[PDB]
Paper text:
RNA polymerase II (RNAPII) transcribes DNA wrapped in the nucleosome by stepwise pausing, especially at nucleosomal superhelical locations −5 and −1 [SHL(-5) and SHL(-1), respectively]. During nucleosome transcription, RNA polymerase II (RNAPII) gradually peels the DNA from the histone surface without histone dissociation, until it reaches the center of the nucleosomal DNA (the dyad DNA). Conversely, in the histone chaperone-independent pathway, the histone transfer from in front to behind RNAPII is proposed to occur via the formation of a template DNA loop, in which the upstream DNA exiting RNAPII rebinds to the histones within the partially unwrapped nucleosome downstream of the RNAPII.
In both structures, the upstream DNA is sharply kinked at the DNA exit site of RNAPII, and is folded back toward the downstream nucleosome. In the RNAPII-nucleosomeL40 structure, the nucleosomal histones are located close to RNAPII and may directly contact it. Consequently, the nucleosome orientation relative to RNAPII differs by about 50° between the RNAPII-nucleosomeL40 and RNAPII-nucleosomeL60 structures. The DNA-binding surface of the proximal H2A, H2B, and H3, which formerly contacted the DNA, becomes accessible and captures the upstream DNA.
Numbering used by the authors:
A (entry chain c): 12 to 117
B (entry chain e): 43 to 134
C (entry chain f): 25 to 102
D (entry chain d): 32 to 123
E (entry chain b): 25 to 101
F (entry chain a): 39 to 133
G (entry chain g): 17 to 109
H (entry chain h): 36 to 123
DNA sequence: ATCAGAATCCCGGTGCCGAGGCCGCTCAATTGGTCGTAGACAGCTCTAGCACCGCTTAAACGCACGTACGCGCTGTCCCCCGCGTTTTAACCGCCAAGG
DNA sequence: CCTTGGCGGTTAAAACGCGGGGGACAGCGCGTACGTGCGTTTAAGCGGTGCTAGAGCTGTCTACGACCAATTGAGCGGCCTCGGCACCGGGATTCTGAT
């Protein structure tokens, strides 16, 4: 019949077929379910969406139309749960959150 | 004393550019690497990765160090503060 | 070349880290710490490079070294 | 030879959540790094889950449990919703 | 039930940690900390337990949770 | 002829650093664990070894934390640990 | 096998665990020999020190406390096991 | 479990010394832990280099990555020595 | 209370490498047929554990009286900060030593 | 008449040199909660007693997974367009030193 992609069937933007292949050749298990790559692709897509949402918001706050690594850093660090998820991750060219000790201030 | 320091804090916390000079960092990396294996080459992105990682590390270390100094009712970070921070981190 | 990491550069890094005032002995101390850090990462990186039978340290070798040292780095997988 | 990244999918998602917003190449590199990282975390945890329970198959259930272990709170619940909905729709 | 972790017990733990003198406010603080820790481990542990379609938390579930928090425990395998 | 302040504390430090027994009472720990667990998943049971594992882990964690806390207090030229010290230790740990 | 490699640790078992551990599609003949040798070596070092500790405490049997003392008083073993909790090991005085 | 092998080793290094059940449990935990660290690292090494086979070379590199200093040198020596003897 | 001084943020004016879009080919995803071993379902035993209890007591908080720990301020001395002088950290475009 | 050395210099950034400012170390004096010895009422250690609960094992039934041949959608080479915000110079606003 006319081909329909697994991503299209799953209602996703992220590639289910590619994710499946990566699972198969990643030596994770002897067999893989069909639903596994669908689920995984969906989760990855969702997380990507949350981060791009916050980073885009940060980009608009700086009167900017293009997201840069700084915006990703602002997005991640000002979000408690993303900050937890990426607690051991370095964002290149992200810098740091503005934060000075109030006590130190004159 | 302090006003320009505060100014600098605001300035550099606002920006994201690398704070160590590129060429001397490059030299340091190649020197250290030369001590493990000779006639090594480097992708430019490899050195860039090393510098981003190193500066993020040092910056975080300085945050913790600052907290250690402030804890001891000081405003000036000292080697003691760095050593405490790194000890609690499990680096030493 | 560790001395190439100048007083002003270390001062800038500390500023980003929120430091207002800096003892004179800090800089040398910092140079020690950084040195150690680099030695640990680069070592592993070179190990990867040697395992792949290459003479060129790649960005990915560095990324893997950082990852196994729990220093995950984003932005250089490309 | 062919080279691969998540770039176009990240872009599509970006256009979903911010129709008038673009993204630098470096930021895209960071997003690709992110996706690969979370992929390895989830797949790895699911592999361990399957092994612990003497199962040779990684299913959506392993993926779900792995998501619950790795992600905090609301992020986990929302991710679970997206995953479950995607699988239920896909099967139908 | 958090009060079941009594002052003396906390003093004993601190002694093992080499602490010579202890503020009165420590104990409640400690309890909070302990609570958080437990909540983090048990959560993950139970997750494992439910993945195995069981109702009994095993020693291995705990071990896996601790392991995944980077709090590796020897002696209960 | 009562002992000097700071002698029995030290003696206790010696004593408990020289031993390995669990320092928290079993039953209250059990009750606390089961209580916390009820808030995640219901009608749970526990192997005794599971609870024991939780207690070894918890006590090891608390002891290490108290070591770091002590280091913070000593850093501030004190001999007395305060909640402030614990909070510093936990912040630097990334907790 | 283990006799031929001069090892006490089970080469066959290590090989099997490698095959079924989802590590790679294939496993070389020398890999389990090497790995078994490494594991045996590390075990030997730790049991050496822990045994010495037992002698100091005048107990023939080795208990977790002795293992803790052995590991923590050795710099490299201590780094290797920096994130490990030994049940009933206590701490260094 | 590795109990019988741990015991054998123990009898090699301390002929008149025994071991409690708990301590044995800790040794078993140890052996499994290091097994997973080394095998995992070797797996990643094989994947990074698009190799489908884990060989003694991956094991060795993994050991050099995971073990500190003298432990690494000696472990590497023992591994190579064992492979050489096995091969003979 | 006010009054003067360098540093900060946005506006005429604009371009150059960064970002986005057609044509199409060889690589990745889909369809199709054949084993084929794995998952959901259903039944059965009894052991590790759940909930309250008898005997016993170690033990956490409060009483009596006091002292070294914590802290704000005083007296002193003790270490960073800014502009002019340049230089070797570098990087470019011409002389003179053995073939 | 053909090869590859170091001073010479566009850019910009801190060791010396003199005047200036904010903070650490020890004591005065205050304020006080647990050390050490007891006194009381409660839940845990140890061992009993009743009981309701599902994990490992085995058999049914089912079906997508993996592997081996065609078929097709597509991401970037190769170009071909389209554009975002800092450099240049200037206007308007702001903490800090000084009266």
């Amino acid at each position: 019949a006319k081909a329909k992609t697994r991503s299209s069937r799953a209602g996703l933007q992220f590639p289910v077929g590619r994710v499946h292949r990566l699972l198969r050749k990643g030596n994770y298990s002897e067999r893989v379910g069909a639903g596994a790559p669908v689920y995984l692709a969906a989760v990855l897509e969702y997380l990507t969406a949350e981060i791009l949402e916050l980073a885009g918001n940060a980009a608009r706050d700086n009167k900017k139309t293009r997201i840069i690594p700084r915006h990703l850093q602002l997005a991640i660090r000002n979000d408690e749960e993303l900050n937890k998820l990426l607690g051991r991750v370095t964002i290149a060219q992200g810098g740091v959150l503005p934060n000075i000790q109030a006590v130190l201030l004159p | 004393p302090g006003t320009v320091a505060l100014r600098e804090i605001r300035r550099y916390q606002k920006s994201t550019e690398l704070l160590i000079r590129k060429l001397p960092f490059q030299r340091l990396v190649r020197e250290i690497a030369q001590d493990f294996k000779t006639d090594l080459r480097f992708q430019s992105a490899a050195i860039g990765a090393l510098q981003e990682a190193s500066e993020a590390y040092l910056v975080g270390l300085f945050e913790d160090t600052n907290l250690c100094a402030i804890h001891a009712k000081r405003v000036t970070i000292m080697p003691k503060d760095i050593q405490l921070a790194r000890r609690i981190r499990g680096e030493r | 070349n560790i001395q190439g990491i100048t007083k002003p550069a270390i001062r800038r890094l500390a500023r980003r880290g929120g430091v207002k005032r800096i003892s004179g002995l800090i800089y040398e101390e910092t140079r020690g710490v950084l040195k150690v850090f680099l030695e640990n990462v680069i070592r592993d990186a070179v190990t990867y490079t040697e395992h792949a039978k290459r003479k060129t340290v790649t960005a990915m070798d560095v990324v893997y070294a950082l990852k196994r040292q729990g220093r995950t780095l984003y932005g250089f997988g490309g | 030879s062919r080279k691969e990244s998540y770039s176009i999918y990240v872009y599509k998602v970006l256009k979903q959540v911010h129709p008038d917003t673009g993204i630098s190449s470096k930021a895209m590199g960071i997003m690709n790094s992110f996706v690969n990282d979370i992929f390895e975390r989830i797949a790895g945890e699911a592999s361990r889950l399957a092994h612990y329970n003497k199962r040779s198959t990684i299913t959506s259930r392993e993926i779900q449990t792995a998501v619950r272990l790795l992600l905090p709170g609301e992020l986990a619940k929302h991710a679970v919703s997206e995953g479950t909905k995607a699988v239920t729709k896909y099967t139908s």
